[PDB]
């Protein structure tokens, strides 16, 4: 037995979201989760589940549930899926093919845009190789793009790896800030600790 209601508000209604390259993860355990306050909320532009059906989610029990949250522009939310390619999927957040979980996104223009463009939200534009699934890279080492070594951006063929989104509230919807939460359901050959209601 266990009585706690899982703290999804901590992750969803959070004030500051992570830059996609340095994405955040929260462990959700020893609590009970009513998923109906998620797929029945009219707040989300995207709610796409894999290996599970969202309707039939309150009937299962998991060892742990992990929530990865970050921000990208809307035209890139399609990359947050198994087998996707592109800047975000290749250099920032790659989901595996065998992925089991739900991917949730919603417009955060009222929250993440400047007048003038929000430069705090960043994404990786250069990397020597693609990420493994669920791999993370918060390095800011200057990107060598020629045969010549690098010190700072001022060097030739020395690019700064990160790029700013510059979120303005006047952008097209495809350039607008979209907050993304990705749930992975981890069921191990260990006692389950996060269950649906009843």
């Amino acid at each position, epitope marked *: 037995n266990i009585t706690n209601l899982c703290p999804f508000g901590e992750v969803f209604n959070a004030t500051r979201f992570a830059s996609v390259y*340095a994405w*955040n993860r*929260k462990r959700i355990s020893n609590c009970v989760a009513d998923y109906s306050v998620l797929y029945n909320s009219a707040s989300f532009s995207t709610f796409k589940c894999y290996g599970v059906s969202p309707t039939k989610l309150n009937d299962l029990c998991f060892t742990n549930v992990y929530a990865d949250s970050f921000v990208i522009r809307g035209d890139e939310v399609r990359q947050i899926a198994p087998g996707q390619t592109g800047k975000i999927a290749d250099y920032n957040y790659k989901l595996p093919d065998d992925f089991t979980g739900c991917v949730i996104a919603w417009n955060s223009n009222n929250l993440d845009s400047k007048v003038g463009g929000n430069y705090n939200y960043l994404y990786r534009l250069f990397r020597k190789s693609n990420l*493994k699934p669920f791999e*993370r890279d*918060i390095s800011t*080492e200057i990107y060598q793009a020629g045969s010549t070594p690098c010190n700072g951006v001022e060097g030739f063929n020395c690019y700064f790896p990160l790029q700013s989104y510059g979120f303005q509230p006047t952008n097209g919807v495809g350039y607008q800030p979209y907050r993304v939460v990705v749930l992975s359901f981890e069921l191990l050959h260990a006692p389950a600790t996060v269950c649906g209601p009843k």
Partner: antibody
Amino acid sequence: EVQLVESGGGLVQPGGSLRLSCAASGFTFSSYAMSWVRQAPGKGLEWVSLISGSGGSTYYADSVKGRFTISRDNSKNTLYLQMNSLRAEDTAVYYCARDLWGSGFFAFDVW
Amino acid sequence: DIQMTQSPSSLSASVGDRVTITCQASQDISNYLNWYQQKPGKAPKLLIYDASNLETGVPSRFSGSGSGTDFTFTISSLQPEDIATYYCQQDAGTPLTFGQGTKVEIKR
């Protein structure tokens, strides 16, 4: 239970070489980023290097670039640190540390 | 490099006292700051990850708080088995860096 056991520490001449070994047991080694963290005697802590689970991505502190090399054989559940051009300042106790989630650059949960 | 500064360098408190250590970051690093304990001749102890999340199997008297630049680590009731050096570590960028450490002692 999760276990990390380090080995290879000894006395070397300045400029000498040395290969540290960290034997891992109790978890799926191949799915966690691992890191090396050293401590000079009576000093604080200093992150040294990090390797991703597959081993494809490696990161170093500037103070050890080009001298040290992190590596792993997911077959033997072993993490390695190859240290060349050692200096008096590298004198420290060396720990291997597991990433809290395994993705990389999270808290070090096991030492 | 993000330079983490700990205050105090060392403190002594009576058994059962409430004890508070702060880590001061040289920039706003959000909640990217973990806390470690190291007892003499032993390896570090992951105590608090992110800014306030208490690791599995850690006494409830330990709790973290803060965000931005000032982070607090709190012992609600200091116990003799808490004699160790406590380290904060930043999680926002490479190189990952630690505070210089804070040495806790018992005033008796």
